[PDB]
Design an enzyme around this catalytic site. Sequence first.
Site, PDB file in Angstrom:
ATOM      1  N   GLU A  35       0.814  -1.209   0.000  1.00  0.00           N
ATOM      2  CA  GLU A  35       0.000   0.000   0.000  1.00  0.00           C
ATOM      3  C   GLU A  35       0.854   1.269   0.000  1.00  0.00           C
ATOM      4  OE1 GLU A  35      -3.129   0.405  -0.452  1.00  0.00           O
ATOM      5  OE2 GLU A  35      -3.934  -1.627  -0.239  1.00  0.00           O
ATOM      6  N   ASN A  46      -7.450   9.592  -6.055  1.00  0.00           N
ATOM      7  CA  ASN A  46      -8.271   8.660  -6.821  1.00  0.00           C
ATOM      8  C   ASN A  46      -9.238   9.404  -7.738  1.00  0.00           C
ATOM      9  OD1 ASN A  46      -7.392   6.208  -5.469  1.00  0.00           O
ATOM     10  ND2 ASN A  46      -8.429   7.094  -3.679  1.00  0.00           N
ATOM     11  N   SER A  50     -11.432  11.236  -3.935  1.00  0.00           N
ATOM     12  CA  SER A  50     -10.894  10.844  -2.642  1.00  0.00           C
ATOM     13  C   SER A  50      -9.382  10.697  -2.737  1.00  0.00           C
ATOM     14  CB  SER A  50     -11.500   9.518  -2.159  1.00  0.00           C
ATOM     15  OG  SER A  50     -11.066   8.404  -2.939  1.00  0.00           O
ATOM     16  N   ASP A  52      -6.133   8.404  -0.626  1.00  0.00           N
ATOM     17  CA  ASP A  52      -5.739   7.377   0.332  1.00  0.00           C
ATOM     18  C   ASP A  52      -4.546   7.909   1.123  1.00  0.00           C
ATOM     19  OD1 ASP A  52      -7.681   5.696  -0.798  1.00  0.00           O
ATOM     20  OD2 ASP A  52      -6.232   4.567  -1.956  1.00  0.00           O
ATOM     21  N   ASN A  59      -8.883   5.507   3.007  1.00  0.00           N
ATOM     22  CA  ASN A  59      -9.600   6.289   2.015  1.00  0.00           C
ATOM     23  C   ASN A  59     -10.484   7.370   2.629  1.00  0.00           C
ATOM     24  OD1 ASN A  59     -12.358   6.330   0.172  1.00  0.00           O
ATOM     25  ND2 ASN A  59     -10.452   6.361  -1.005  1.00  0.00           N
ATOM     26  N   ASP A 101     -15.835  -4.181   9.278  1.00  0.00           N
ATOM     27  CA  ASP A 101     -17.041  -3.705   8.610  1.00  0.00           C
ATOM     28  C   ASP A 101     -17.769  -4.773   7.806  1.00  0.00           C
ATOM     29  OD1 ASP A 101     -18.748  -1.376   8.045  1.00  0.00           O
ATOM     30  OD2 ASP A 101     -18.126  -1.717   5.959  1.00  0.00           O
TER      31      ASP A 101
END
EC number: 3.2.1.17
Length: 127
Positions: A35, A46, A50, A52, A59, A101
């Site tokens: 990452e 992005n 957004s 990261d 994000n 989540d």
Amino acid sequence: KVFGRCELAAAMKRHGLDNYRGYSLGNWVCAAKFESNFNTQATNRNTDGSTDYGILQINSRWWCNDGRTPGSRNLCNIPCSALLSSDITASVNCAKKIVSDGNGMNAWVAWRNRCKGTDVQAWIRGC
Ligand SMILES: [Cl-]
């Protein structure tokens, strides 16, 4: 800062990520490698507006608030700027919410594509 591999493994373990929600520590180290290349200040914009942020590329549409992302939900209740600290506390705390989540570590594209299915224990070997 740029963490070493075992240096980050030890810090992530102190912060409770080893086996968290079913994901052994090597998953988290591999995720950070691909990452952010272990850099706590990595940022990537992005197509959806957004960005990261940080060691785990969290994000700004769903998880942290950067004040410039349409459709922000801030589900980690944290400013994205805090995720660029050299201290990984805020990124770990948000990652724990993300992985709880309902879709596991699939939120991390680099983990999904470059870690999942490999021998991730190699990332903590020798530490
Ligand atoms: Cl911010």
